[model samples]
Target: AHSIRVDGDIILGGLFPVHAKGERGVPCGELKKEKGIHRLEAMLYAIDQINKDPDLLSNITLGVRILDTCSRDTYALEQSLTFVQKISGVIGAAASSVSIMVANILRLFKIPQISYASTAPELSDNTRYDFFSRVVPPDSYQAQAMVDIVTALGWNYVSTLASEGNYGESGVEAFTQISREIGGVSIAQSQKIPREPRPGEFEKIIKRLLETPNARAVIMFANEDDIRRILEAAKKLNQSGHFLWIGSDSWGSKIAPVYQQEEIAEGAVTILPKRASIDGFDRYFRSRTLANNRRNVWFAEFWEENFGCKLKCTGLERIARDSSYEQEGKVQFVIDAVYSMAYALHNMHKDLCPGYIGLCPRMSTIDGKELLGYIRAVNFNGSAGTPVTFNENGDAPGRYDIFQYQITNKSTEYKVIGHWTNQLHLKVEDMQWAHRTHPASE
Candidate 1:
């Protein structure tokens, strides 16, 4: 029930699934169940890191009044309004629809809502949703990348799978539109997977894939669940690996390559938002120990909630002790989301208060419109070592690196093979494609 509270001079808001309470209008109700634990932790990591870093916000404290969306937009709206007038800006609501819902409501107050993972093409409408901006590029960009990989491989025939919702529908639609004039590459069979896929329907889809063997590749513009179910069925039917899989950035990281072990998904290709290592985050995340983390705010609660343990967490202490924590992709962008605001606030302070390290007297009066102007105009090297900048529509330019998800020694690893630019060109080495020697095995 903690709606809104202030930490310091710079008050900011966040929306993430802090609690796993079931909420309507979402697939996975639990935060950790859908792999949201680290993402929220990363948000806290950014807030804590920004408060300590003098260069970023200087003496001005950056406080986050985070809300638990619980995978529902109603709750997201309920919490978002609490800090709207009092807070400077907003960050979060991971999915596209919820973010859109949040964007419409927050924009009424002219509050800037910077989402980390909202990639639906509809949000790019600067006129309708001018107050909304996000760290990830839109699906239009991802759509192109999805097709470029399919065409670059010279595979003329392919199948498509787009999960339910705006992200999937709009993404698949964008690909279909662009590929209309695109000669050679033909979509043999395109299907839409509903929120809850029917058992018989999926069987028919698989049957279609097996019958249309000429469809050498399948493009999955979906979440982890859709991909898993389809591949599992394909594996059972002994029809797993007739073609490569091209995935959008939606769940590229989450889809394990074990699905590829069936050979259907082997040599699968995915396009991911380009990211680099955040050196500071790496060490902080790995050093987490329950012994020293007794009252460690979010980390302790997260440990207990996900792993199911008391304060001591006896046997499952490894959850915190495990130092191999790697915060990549979405979390890096979460960091970018936080830093984007921090840097914009920093520039505001510098421009307004000359040599003022401490709280700028004008900080309290800074409005969302002003902060948004700074955010949209922000240009710098983010923690991921990527150039962080927004285009006219208030989106990161659509530039993505291609990674081949390969299974080795029963482990899934994604290797960067090439890249697709905003110019919509696919550039990759012939060796990388040829090196896919370990084709999907029966």
Candidate 2:
């Protein structure tokens, strides 16, 4: 199926995980609400808001052609290839491996690509993927955050699980390297889980994790699916309380992985990129209907599937009645990403054609390389109330929210117990551990 396209004067390309992982060699499976649809809609919302503002783009209207990555690198590569046509910039490909693949191609064309989520440390290297940038900090800083959390809890020995991809592999490597560099910490066993695991794969990994009984801390750097599979394996082995988890951002508070496995995930601490709800996005999103929002082709699918009702048969009750729809964490980052491109184009316009209402003469054949310079130079206060600026490496400053899964009255919830920037600000007393005392102390 073709991607959704919106027409305008200046077009930005988008690659989003609109569909979940493919099954049995299919390109896609199900609609992913939070990561896929929410991020995609945020980009759309930003474009509309920017066009409405008379000062931002003036006579130029920002438009987009967004493709579904299907949460797979191969699919993402296929989708991103379509962006090789006329486009000012490109905005997504959430997975680091997917982003890297897209970046390899985009850099050759000198087309700028911004990501809200891809955080593998390798993306920060300017010598290779110079055209790629992200609103989220790279995983190197996240590794530090994980280490600090471990040391703070006085856990000296821990095992690790790395999924077979750039995000998981790079994240686990950094954690292991840092753990060794820091005093009084050691990895009992570091296991790599294949992207497509066999029947007993997760069970074997879990058995290895149990080798060193004292090493109860199992740090996980895997995608949501892999993490959930591991938890299922743990449950089958009756090892729910055997390990305390330290999770990477890939599965942070995302409901899919932990939905049915909350018991196994209890006392787990996960790190997520610092984000806030965009001010007007919720209202905009709720106000949208299949009739009014015809540009987004996937919207009808999402609407029917999300609410479990047909568009034609359903009345207005199904549209805005769901208050349970939680705001996705990366909405502001997506907004900031779109704004970054708009601001860069705005700056390019001002410099190319002074006092021009629309695209200047030089903009007729826009230079991606020159526009890249403006992208790197943009500095603004983001909708999330943080300063948005890229360093020389095209990376936003490191910041994170630390969450711990705790059960209350038979209900499980991930609570924000701390925040991380340069250092960890964890509330030790607020945490509830599987081990009665600190694991290291015990």
Candidate 3:
């Protein structure tokens, strides 16, 4: 029998068109660089850990093949599918929405493709079936967490500024529904400028935010660059005091010193997955890579230490590495996805009885439908500081961390404020009380 192997791909790295200041102070399109190599590094660390595990597929060795998606474009997804077609099993083609869309294609081939970061809620809607799984909690979970945090802070009126893309728009919609269900009114809504905005555009948005009646807080469903720009504009307009800023995990990284500008990020709060901690994982990451250079290395270390192996360079050299000093809790989402997939696969294989299914089942006895029953009850203690378990809908059950960004002396820092495993009890109570004291027409 042939060995069972796992092939994968990392697609996030690529140059993108971003707005830059022109000589005449106008916004112009320029190639904006993105750091996608961090995800690649994490994938490499995971492969190494899995390959070195003695108990995993002891009778068969798992091999990995990695392909780069080479930009945010979905065109690369087709190429990845072709590459994955040549292999027996595929582990990933990591891009949130791209992976979800690609999983539909894989369903035709009966190949399993798990995403490390795709958390769009619609991906789990049964149509995708066993071909899809992810580690990060969906936006629905984050939306619930946001409502919980806002209600706890006693903020009744809020405004939202969301980017127009998948990450931003979906998050905004989910948050909007959750806020409404929790009885909080969204007073104003603004869309981010198509490209990076001119200084005045950001200022204009902040000015608009300040004008919203009773709007004491703002939820920014945008990436870090936009978040920073909005904050800078707010600082210049002296409107930072008018409302609090809240963010999602996508903007949760420690880079860019957004926190250092205390006037902007002070008292900002967000929701994120829990950060991973393993013995010596941080030390290993630091020793191998430059400090502050490898973004999201903390996530890489979590993968390494949990799998109990060091990473191998492309030259096939094994190297001990150190974890990142700068950490954000979001990477836990990816790590959890990998663990969940492996656990699901293990369970599925176990159900096959004789450990390995022979190639090509006879048509008379073959079950044409894909196997998905195993994943619905899948549960495991993930590297990311929580017990990760999935419900029938593929939504992670009861996993979310609420964090507050505190600015001191012009530097931003994060503190884990609270957690919600299931439902929004505290939030519901606050909303009900508000309704009793201040009645509003339905």
Candidate 4:
């Protein structure tokens, strides 16, 4: 009869694109090697923190089955299946497509899904996606932000490129609608490029982008891979004009366009989720290296690729600490995602049994449908130091940071110029555009 565990601890599932980081995504064929391993480690740190602290879940041990979604809905579903009836909740599937795909399936079992990265407009549907909740804001607010950015810069005409999926299709549609509805600005040309675009396919894309002289700005929505292809191709041209490139949340301006690709993304500005400073998490993250930290499952490969050398190599002590500082900490959100589940579980136990689970007579049983109601009610200040609450549509208040990529003689990077909040809209007095217009020395 022991089909699933009836244990004292609460089991939560985590679905992350551990291997789905690059342009190719988690390979249906072989996918890309595991990337964004930090997010997964962040998940581990959060759970460990929760279990160690008696303040959160008094009588319960929070257990997790962290799965590698490989960034595909097919893979996400396959991984999610194991945690269906057993788990109290879930943490992610980094992409919107995978989140939506898995959420649709898991909601059938009434399991609450808390995603950190899925930002499609559809996942907010309460009627259909009642069980799905996200800490990241949906695409509607992001769309509005995109409009304001293009309009604020007073760019009259622009070209666009979107990835070939739900996130891409829906994102461009929202941008197009917003542009047409209210704006002096208009999209002169927009194209949907393959997520992992072929070189020839990308050649025309780059050609069209360059040929259109009226547009001084280009708004592109795709992962780092697609963006890299376009930018890489554009780097070849001898007479490439300066462009004000705008980007979406997925990869956006996070990647530094160094050396050959420098000119393409020089003055690019991108809007993505606002990241919170998790000081404790960063310290812990820095602690885990290839030589130590046995929990780092992919430390071997990460060491090989990151240091460009083997783990046992003599310079294992040589991984620079500053690189951790430069890494935009999405681990905060991963930590928050885990916290959302733990908080909900704490509330659900109290509401049903009215005390710590160890002493409750009814604590042994769990009702998934009843627990879903409690999840919706849970709210608190997250470890990332942000207000963690969900709207009626299972969406959080949209908060975004606007970053512009700049390269100077001294340094090259993405610098935050402004932030967008549900209340403040966008406050951009110190934006990075001036970094582009003025000299690097200034």
Candidate 5:
């Protein structure tokens, strides 16, 4: 009898909300929509190329499936799990938090799930039989990047405003820890704001921060929406009091232009993956549009162009196609994840027992202990322009580039101020002293 070939479907899901842009233009909210479609397109491009390449998976064809976790209900998470259970495997999730929650379910079910955008530190932590990967560096890596920025800038007193969710809270905590480790006083104020806040809410939070004494700088750990609001509020308050602003990768996009009219976001700086000077991305984007064919616009676009489909709006697209000077670094993670997964599957196919086939093993029978070892050993070059290497904790040991954005000549421009790739470390003795002198307990 002919070999019994089982076709597998890889499902990608996410919660993508479109934000409102400035007046008389496509709503900035469309950023997620555009990003989602681009990621899907990039995945399609990847699938097509992989299928066409006989050496990659000879005589085996892989199918790609996509689902949108329409930001409305947590039900989308359940729906995504159901879809994964029904499918042979899962390839994505644009949302890190959702990916973490879904990865838990998939672990219970023994499904293989990889997220293109999920980078929270806890997603891959302590999971059994579930394989989680992201195209973006984890919040830990980015937080370290932030610490490097703080030390290099020589800023003394820093305040932070973090979103209450995992991305915000975890990032804030990580930055705070790193700050203390490096002898810097980090006063992080947690804000309980929705994913999308109403007008003036972000401003109120900024005002509150301003009221705090000796807060020379602020590290914003919120999402793009709140970041924009804070910038707007800053402009309204005319609060350019010689302070430096630091942020995570989420703040490393062109959306700065959406709120540029307010003039507050001009001197803001953030840590990104470092794509400041990569050539051909902008040219390719313009060419794709002119061709009347949607090409992958960012790193996600590369996946879409490679896979030949459209992704949903989940910020993955923006991170992938971001043309800011900081894009090169960001694209590295996506590139790393895609190539690493392919390599993982390739190696698993070679190593599996006679009865087993590809890496798409049923979640129930998965040997977590052995598989985790296998995943940890899996390494390759990523879209982010680095060799993909993961630590024992499953975190990508990748480098990050620090970028600053300013509105010059009425256009938002970015520049790479520094680069950190696991080499630079800081001393936080001052932070320890301040914490001791002014204990939170008191």
Candidate 6:
């Protein structure tokens, strides 16, 4: 069990995908910085901030028992169950599939769970998942974002591909249904990538795109790994500029998929939850060292991977001093999640212990069901300076950043070219097309 534990009067549980899925017989893979370390650090930063503040959670210290899920549902489920030991609340299990599995089990005991990322629509039902909540909007809105992009661009005929499982399948389902309901747009082809695809299957899917008439605009709802595979296949087939891509939040702002396959992914449009790096988080992150963050259990590995230096080999760089190292965009949401729990506990402390500085008599045995009410009711200007509140379905309102992958002479970048909430605000002139012109469906 990979875990980081901190002691306090009340403990909060956390689940993060600190590592990617393992290979052959292993249970965990390499470090995932953007999705894993950055988000985890943000949570810790929020907790530290909350504890240092005298106004919030006065005399009541917040502690954590965070576990690494390794980006697997079964592993996440196993990590999640440990929280039942005696946690007041929980945050994360970023992947929707993992969230659903953890939410189902956590709901049985009515423990409150707040997700910073999980966007599957199935988890939007408050009646079904009373104890679950998230800061990010569900994929239902993400699907609409894709539809609006397709419709606004006048791509009447397009093809779609989804990574198998909750996030991708449900996203494509919503996108397909939405396109059908709306008049002008049409889907020429629809397919799915298996969780464990056979060799050459990815390339076959790319070839299928050519078989369908007027299906050049390819909308993909896949995890980062699958996105990389498909892009690699496309590059191998020499279909560099043959297709236009519209990506779901899965690949948004992440460079892994197009790191080396830039030409194949150039001029691609992608969506991610509206986010900004939390203030002071970058400074906090850059200041950490293996000696200081030893409790994390994985910081030493993260240090080696991040700085590309092994501790045993060299010791000149005793501290992290990189000024340009930015925390992941989702860091705001992770901070918001920790604060939400703090506020909920603060409010609960007020109600149950009225006039008490620390835990009162009843605080000894906090009820998860009761705490959930406070979580749903938490509303404030979050770290992103956006309002954070849960609806009846335990979901925050929709807001997403639309980005385009642009390749310059010297470097590649994912630029924020638009935004989406209730309406799409795309800048058509700002978008760079694959063939120096808008892609032709035919």
The order of the candidates by lDDT, greatest first, is 2, 6, 1, 4, 5, 3
Worst 10 residues of 1 by lDDT: 431-440
For 327-427, candidate 3 gives per-residue lDDT tens digits of: 33434444455555555545655655444442222211212133344555676776645687766666655466565665545444566666667754332
Clashing pairs in 1: 240-264, 241-263, 241-264, 263-440
Q: Which ten residues in a row have the lowest lDDT in candidate 4?
A: 433-442
Assess every candidate by TM-score. Answer: 0.84, 0.94, 0.70, 0.88, 0.72, 0.94
> Which scores better on TM-score, 4 or 6?
6
> Candidate 2: worst 10 consecutive residues by lDDT?
433-442
lDDT by residue (tens digit), candidate 1, 384-424:
67889887889988878777766566665677778878654
Clashing residue pairs in candidate 6 are none
Residue pairs that clash (backbone atoms under 3 angstroms), model 4? 19-34, 27-31
The digit string of per-residue lDDT tens for model 6 on 203-275 reads 9998888787467799999988889989999889788777888988888888678767888899999999988
Whole-model lDDT per candidate: 0.71, 0.86, 0.52, 0.71, 0.53, 0.84
Weakest lDDT window of 10 consecutive positions for candidate 6: 315-324
Stretches of model 6 off by over 4 angstroms after superposition? 24-26, 311-313, 316-324, 436-442
Measured by lDDT, the strongest candidate is: 2
lDDT of 2 by residue, 109-196 (tens): 8899999899999999998998998999999999999999999999988988898899999899999889778677898888999876
Alpha-carbon runs more than 4 Å astray in model 2: 309-320, 434-442
lDDT tens string, model 5, 46-95? 55556677777554555544544543225346556555433434655555
Residue 64 Cα positional deviation in candidate 4, in Å, after optimal superposition: 1.6
- Residue 154 accuracy (lDDT) in model 1: 82
